[PDB]
Design a protein around this ligand. Structure first.
Ligand SMILES: CCCCCCCCCCCCCCCCCC(=O)OC[C@H](CO)OC(=O)CCCCCCCCCCCCCCCCC
Ligand SMILES: CCCCCCCCCO
Lengths: 219, 103, 209, 219
């Protein structure tokens, strides 16, 4: 079972605040420490702070600007990190991890992509990508999806809800006028489409709008 | 209030005095000597505790004659105090073992 | 003796930006380091004790970190009143030692100087001498030149200048050019001007009486 | 209250001696250490020595030339530093500080500016600085004072005895033939002078001669 659960994304405008959550499952001892790790795009891991739910004491990184407040809740087994007065520099993916008190991080969370901007939340527009009429096909056929006009990141694109993994590419998003845009491709054998259904699943946690899209050949 | 409980109680009080005074005398003796780390009262008090209890981690150690002379006093006062308690605990147990017999 | 190295000696930073000072010990001293502040002609003021522990009275703008040999004093969004000399001091081994010090300066916007010419007082003339004082106040950068022309003729004798460090109220600079002349030399001249060549203006800002 | 008090300045000729004082107030414990710090013009801080008034023991810096003698006086709570046979290299500002025995210096003194020279003590000549007759004034008016012919340094220049602080500059002194010379300026709003009194206060601790000077417009 997924031991550590975190929200997909949180959109915050500068000056405001946000309270991330980290619901934990599995073995919950009294010696467990919940850590938080900040990772800016392209950069490495950065230890923010730690907290022990059993006692409620929390320590923080002192080398950096302290703008985090760690609280716990033993009743629901969920750790909370309070970020106050954020800027563009605070826009990153915040991981949470469980330490047994022996030094290492056994399990991590999916991470919460916190975006700092004054823009508005926009659902993604999903469009199919079927080959043209005069497009010859070999032993393999390449399909795809088009996800654009969404904000903020990220978006989770799966083919056939996970059952399709091989021959799948999901290109990084580009930013054009406060709107992210990416595309995903799938490569199935030529003798399997459109006989067998191939559909993409696009999830946008920032607006909580997950939609599907079947790839049918051009009529 | 017998003797053994009186001496053990007085030893505990005296030990506290030695710990406090030892911290004061250590800093006073260690300052002036280059490289000495026992030059502040709070950690000197911590040093005194791990000295009287014999332990002696090694994080703090006197390097002067009078600083080490003070340390010896702390050691002896520590060992004697913790030893005077044990002797008091024995007299207590012995005197009660007679009560479980015919005395 | 424990050596404390503060590099760089001069730290230049834009207003409202996070600035970090460095202090390095020649050997491990745990967290037994202390930070002080000293403005122009002032006494040292304790900012941070024991590496990271804050001091009551000191603004929350200041913070400290580090352990062992490397320590750092940081100022989240520096302002004009933070212009001073920052020293670090260790208390791990005897004797206590200080750092070489670090000068903090703010790079503000270009500001035009405010020239002000002043005739000699009537009390000074009675003494048997005279002196015309010129004030070039609140300019940036500090690179500036002052010229004295008596009757249109440039004067260089009897000119004593004095520049101030970066003012801790607006991050600017100021100087005072004083032309000292005997009373006899002051009578046989009449006109005195004070020119000022600065970056902000191609034409020199002058003031005469 | 001012915890540590020191004399303004002390003028000594080479070969002679001087005994600085450091009267302390506030909480006076038995674990208090009085330190002395030397600072030469343009240079940094330099630890001279330490002393504990409770016991009377004093330690000194061994890396430098030892020409200091630390004594105490528990009756008046004043520490004394005896400097003997001074040269031009010993001319500096000597600070005194109180340590609680925990390593750091909680409070410092104003510092005593010790000057080493064979010159004579001379009171400062203070002169007003009012704008000329044809000097136009904007939304702000700049006044000033002239302090020259004094020895040795320093001099304390205050406007309206402290109530005026904003728009005040005090330029460093220049040395011409054994006589220091500086000037101070004040910038008050144009609609406040000479309606409201603007006077400078010049103190010369070396001769203990503090004088005032009102800035009146030119007649
Ligand atoms: C309790 C008795 C003292 C034990 C600690 C001695 C500290 C020596 C010291 O602090 O030493 C370091 C100290 C530094 O200040 O210097 C000194 O004054 C140390 C000189 C004192 C020791 C005298 C020499 C001892 C000889 C014993 C063996 C020779 C037999 C033959
Ligand atoms: C056993 C303790 C002796 C007392 C030492 C006092 C400190 C001496 C200062 O040099």
């Amino acid at each position: 079972q997924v031991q550590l659960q975190q929200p997909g994304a949180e959109l915050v405008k500068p000056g405001a605040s946000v309270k991330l959550s980290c619901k934990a499952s599995g073995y919950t001892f009294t010696s467990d420490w919940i850590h938080w790790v900040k990772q800016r795009p392209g950069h490495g891991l950065e230890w923010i702070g730690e907290i022990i739910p059993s006692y409620g004491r929390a320590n923080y990184n002192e080398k950096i600007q302290k703008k985090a407040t760690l609280t716990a809740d033993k009743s629901s087994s969920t750790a909370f990190m309070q970020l106050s007065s954020l800027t563009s520099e605070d826009s990153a993916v915040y991981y949470c991890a469980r330490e047994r008190g022996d030094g290492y991080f056994a399990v991590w969370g999916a991470g919460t992509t916190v975006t700092v901007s004054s823009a508005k939340t926009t659902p993604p527009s999903v469009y199919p990508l079927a080959p043209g009429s005069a497009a010859q096909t070999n032993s393999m056929v390449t399909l795809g999806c088009l996800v654009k006009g969404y904000f903020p990141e990220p978006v989770t694109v799966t083919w056939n809800s996970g059952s399709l993994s091989s021959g799948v590419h999901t290109f990084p998003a580009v930013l054009q006028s406060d709107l992210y845009t990416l595309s995903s491709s799938v490569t199935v054998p030529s003798s399997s489409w459109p006989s067998e259904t191939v559909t993409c699943n696009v999830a946008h946690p920032a607006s909580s709008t997950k939609v599907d899209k079947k790839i049918v050949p051009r009529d | 209030s017998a003797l053994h409980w009186r001496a053990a109680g007085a030893a505990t009080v005296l030990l506290v005095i030695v710990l406090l005074a030892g911290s004061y005398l250590a800093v006073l003796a260690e300052r002036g000597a280059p490289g000495a780390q026992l030059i502040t009262y709070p950690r000197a008090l911590w040093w005194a505790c791990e000295t009287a209890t014999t332990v002696g981690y090694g994080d703090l150690c006197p390097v002067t004659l009078w600083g080490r002379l003070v340390a010896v006093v702390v050691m002896v006062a520590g060992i004697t105090s913790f030893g005077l308690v044990t002797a008091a605990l024995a007299t207590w147990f012995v005197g009660r073992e007679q009560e479980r017999r015919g005395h | 003796d424990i050596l404390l190295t503060q590099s760089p000696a001069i730290l230049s930073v834009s207003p409202g930006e996070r600035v970090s000072f460095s202090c390095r010990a020649s050997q491990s001293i745990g967290t037994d380091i202390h930070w002080y502040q000293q403005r122009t002609n002032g006494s040292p003021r304790l900012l941070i004790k024991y590496a990271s522990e804050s001091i009551s009275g000191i603004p929350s703008r200041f913070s400290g970190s580090g352990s062992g040999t490397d320590f750092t004093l940081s100022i989240n969004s520096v302002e004009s009143e933070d212009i001073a000399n920052y020293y670090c001091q260790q208390s791990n081994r005897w004797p206590f030692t200080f750092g070489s010090g670090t000068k903090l300066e703010i790079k503000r916007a270009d500001a035009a100087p405010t020239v002000s010419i002043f005739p000699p007082s009537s009390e000074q003339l009675t003494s048997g001498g005279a002196s015309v004082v010129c004030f070039l106040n609140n300019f940036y950068p500090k690179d500036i030149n002052v010229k004295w022309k008596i009757d249109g003729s440039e004067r260089q004798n009897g000119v004593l200048n004095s520049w101030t460090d970066q003012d801790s109220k607006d991050s600017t600079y100021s100087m005072s050019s004083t032309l000292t002349l005997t009373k006899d030399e002051y009578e046989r001249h009449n006109s005195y001007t004070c020119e000022a060549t600065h970056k902000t203006s191609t034409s020199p800002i002058v003031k005469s009486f």
